[PDB]
Write a protein that binds this ligand. Structure first.
Ligand SMILES: OC[C@H]1O[C@@H](O[C@H]2[C@H](O)[C@@H](O)[C@@H](O)O[C@@H]2CO)[C@H](O)[C@@H](O)[C@H]1O
Ligand SMILES: OC[C@H]1O[C@@H](O[C@H]2[C@H](O)[C@@H](O)[C@@H](O)O[C@@H]2CO)[C@H](O)[C@@H](O)[C@H]1O
Lengths: 132, 132
C-alpha cells in the first residue's frame, strides 16, 4: 500500500503541494486528502489506463468508506516516467486542484470538515510535500 | 499527538529534509525516523528547557519501545518562534544529521534496517518534507 500522512493540519485558505514521480509503467495513481483512511474529502485519481479510462482524471469522495459521485476531468498534464506537482487548496465548500501546467478545477466538499488532517497516496513516489 | 508519515522509503545514501515552525513557547520538539511507532532509528529532540536540559539536542534510539543510550549534542542553532530545516542522511551504520547552519553530527544505527519507512514529529509545525 501507499504512503500515509496523518495529523498535519491543512486549514481553510491554504494549500498542500505534492511533488512525486510517476513510474514509467503506471496505469494510474491516486492522492487522497481527508480526515482518515475511511473519509476522503478528495480521491484524486489520474488514470493512464484504468477502469476503461484513458488519460482522464477521476475524482470522488469517500464517506465512511462509501464512494460518492465521480467527477471526470479531461485535463491531463501527466506523463509516465516523470515528475509531477499538484496543489490542493482548501476553501469553505470546495477544493481547488491546481496542476503544473496552470490548469485548475474545483471539487465539491460533501462532508463535514474543520481541518484536513489526512493524506494518502498510491502509484506515485513521494518527492516532496509542502504546506502553504 | 504529532504528525506521522508512514510507508515512504528512505534508502541508503539518501536524505530526508524536514522544514517546520517552532512555536514561540516551545520547551522542546522531536522528530523520529525509523520503522514504526515502536522502533526509532533516531529520536532527535532539541530541548530549550526540558528534562533539565537547556539548549541541548538529546538523541536516542527506541527498539520495541525501549529507549537506548542517549547522545547529547551542545550544537543548537534553533530559536523559538522561527522556522528550522534539518536533513537526515541514511548511511549503512549511522545517520548523519545536517543542521541549517552547516553543523552536522552522526548518530549510530543500532538496529536492523533495510529502508526507513516511518517518521513522526511533535512540538514542531510541518512546513515541508522532501526526499533527496
Ligand atoms: O470512484 C472512484 C473509484 O473508482 C473505482 O472504479 C470505479 C470506476 O471509476 C467506474 O468506471 C465504475 O463503473 O466502477 C468502479 C467501481 O466499481 C476504483 O476501483 C477505485 O479505486 C476508485 O478510483
Ligand atoms: O532518551 C530520550 C527520552 O528522554 C526522556 O527523558 C529522559 C531524560 O533525557 C533523562 O535526563 C533521564 O534522566 O530520564 C528521562 C527518561 O526517564 C524523555 O521523556 C523522552 O520523551 C525522550 O526524549
Amino acid at each position: 500500500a501507499g504512503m500515509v500522512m496523518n495529523n498535519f493540519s491543512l486549514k481553510q485558505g491554504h494549500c498542500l503541494e505534492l511533488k512525486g514521480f510517476i513510474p514509467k509503467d503506471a496505469k494510474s495513481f491516486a492522492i487522497n486528502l481527508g480526515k482518515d483512511s475511511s473519509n476522503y474529502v478528495i480521491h484524486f485519481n489520474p488514470r493512464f489506463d484504468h477502469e476503461g479510462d484513458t488519460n482522464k482524471i477521476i475524482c470522488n469522495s469517500k464517506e465512511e468508506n462509501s464512494w460518492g459521485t465521480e467527477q471526470r476531468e479531461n485535463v491531463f498534464p501527466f506523463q509516465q516516467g516523470a515528475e509531477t506537482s499538484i496543489c490542493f487548496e482548501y476553501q469553505a465548500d470546495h477544493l481547488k486542484v491546481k496542476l503544473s501546467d496552470g490548469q485548475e478545477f474545483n471539487f465539491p466538499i460533501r462532508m463535514p470538515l474543520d481541518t484536513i488532517t489526512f493524506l494518502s497516496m498510491d502509484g506515485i513516489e513521494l518527492k516532496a510535500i509542502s504546506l502553504h
